[PDB]
């Protein structure tokens, strides 16, 4: 059946989804996620969108602000709007699947509502593709691929040049924060290849 | 995070072995989510963080895949030129360009709502402001605008059936991530994926650049430039957040360095120790590396040289002999709270003192603090992530390596004094500190072991469970938040592939309204602790034979 989604959980409760098309497949995925991790995913959503203070109060206002200042919603929405129907079906199916279970949860909370929701004083709302995308953007991109300390770096360099002088200060900077170190153990052996690109280590942009 | 992939030339009773240990910290419920997908071109099994549509850890019966953070430099800061007379504008290529801006309101439980404005330039979102010079910094990510493509690439790569199809997808993943590949034929591969900027000549990626236009990136580097290797001569691919490739530049983070001292060597050593490894031996590397003190190997030679001439009755001498007899593999005593050997405590105190005496001393305040950590610092709950060689230690390592170091020592970290003298002075500090606390009989020193905590707050510091759901493990283990292994063409199985993983505390985080915990709420917690693992199923026959429950849905879009 084209509308059929089969969910088989193994001996550790791990779900396997069987479906014919993209939307149904990720609908099943989202469904089982809502069953297994609804509170975790709700709080992950609020974490990635900076809406934690909404349920946990003033101690998370700074957190929420920092989250929102670190991305641009409309840009993410534009990327989603540009997705082909096939790719959209991944996100839409996923969200729809979560909503299917979430609706059941809110129809019979006395039996299906995860305890934490009662404890923390709110109830789960439906998800959209944007929400699913932001779980990834906010927990993989914005936190594992968004690292820089250039402003601090420059402060260090400036301090070094003041202590040691211009030339020696620059040299000590290259000693503490080298651009490359040829003795660094590499995952790819030197016999295989090396990186072609070389950079300037003098801050010529000043 | 670590990963080792063993190819046909080094695999025993198999053609390829992939063992992945992504290190995200530890949380309850589990950081990752087990999931199998079968249909619409997918046939996969494994587990993935926050249940992303794409499985970061898994296989499809033909190839397997894994990841560790790349730590490339894909982020630069542009210093935007502002004008008090033109608020909301910045100078770019000779014109005053209007910033993008948006209003946001933070609603607050039991509090007053707060509205504020977020600002963005062509270089990215604005960090803050500095209107004395009339400047504001914008953070430029090479992956900007490629967030969804990266999510999708991580999904579509699951359908690849060979190196070419897989790299086609790796080329579309824009975040700085190491991707790993293995297949049923014993082929293995690695790609340091990600979008990286093609910077203007003279652009030092470690420091900010003007946002006025002349320093704008020329674009992004082609996929050809991304470090990659397919079936390396070595017969294996190992990574523990180390450098991808000779001459490849690291993240600009001042606390992050790829140098001579690198924990990945601990993995290389174990893989190269034996010509071939079995699946079980490959898995055992998790146990060994998770217990391996990472500084012993780096500094023992220095310690031995400095004390080689001291009499047997010199305590500094006996501290070094203690280390020399030690393999660096920590094991808990029967009390389940202290370590059998005091080596790590010795190295901690010594290294702390060394850094204070050397690197810390050569760096102006308050920057000196950046280089004072020994890497052992922790709390009662234990490390929040992996243990590594500290940035200060890596710099000290270059220094004690002398001329064997490729890094010019512009300033002598020992400031004219013989390295031996400083090393011995730190050993004196160490003996005083430790003997004061533990007494003078080293053989009965029972030093505190690090513990491990599955935290109820996610990595943001935000509750994802009730405080009481926090779980505790006596032995800290420097290992993946989860570990998964894929073995291709195992000779002792009727399957073309076997796979295992561990998702602790368990698959489910569900607790019913009446407090009744789900049957799979904690059934992998003890398994995690003892380096156990359970089978991942892929084929309909294997899934069926191990079915616990089934539910069929009929829905129309
Ligand atoms: O190495 C890390 O810090 C965590 C990580 C593992 C795999 C992919 C992305 C991030
Ligand atoms: Ca940079």
XYZ file of C-alpha atoms and ligand atoms in Angstrom, chain A residues 140 144, chain B residues 1 22-24 56-57 67-71 154 176-178 241, ligand 1:
28
model
C 25.474 20.745 14.243
C 30.139 22.397 15.907
C 35.648 12.479 18.552
C 31.818 10.757 18.243
C 32.342 12.759 21.408
C 29.454 15.133 22.105
C 25.587 10.405 10.868
C 26.506 6.887 12.035
C 32.054 11.489 11.180
C 34.261 13.477 13.535
C 34.423 17.279 13.740
C 36.741 18.724 11.104
C 38.028 21.776 12.965
C 24.065 13.876 5.100
C 33.677 21.453 8.601
C 33.317 17.734 9.209
C 35.490 14.702 8.604
C 40.293 15.650 15.982
O 34.065 15.979 17.058
C 33.188 16.607 17.661
O 33.369 17.650 18.398
C 31.715 16.253 17.641
C 31.290 15.777 16.258
C 31.392 14.434 15.809
C 30.973 14.055 14.521
C 30.456 15.096 13.737
C 30.338 16.442 14.146
C 30.760 16.801 15.439
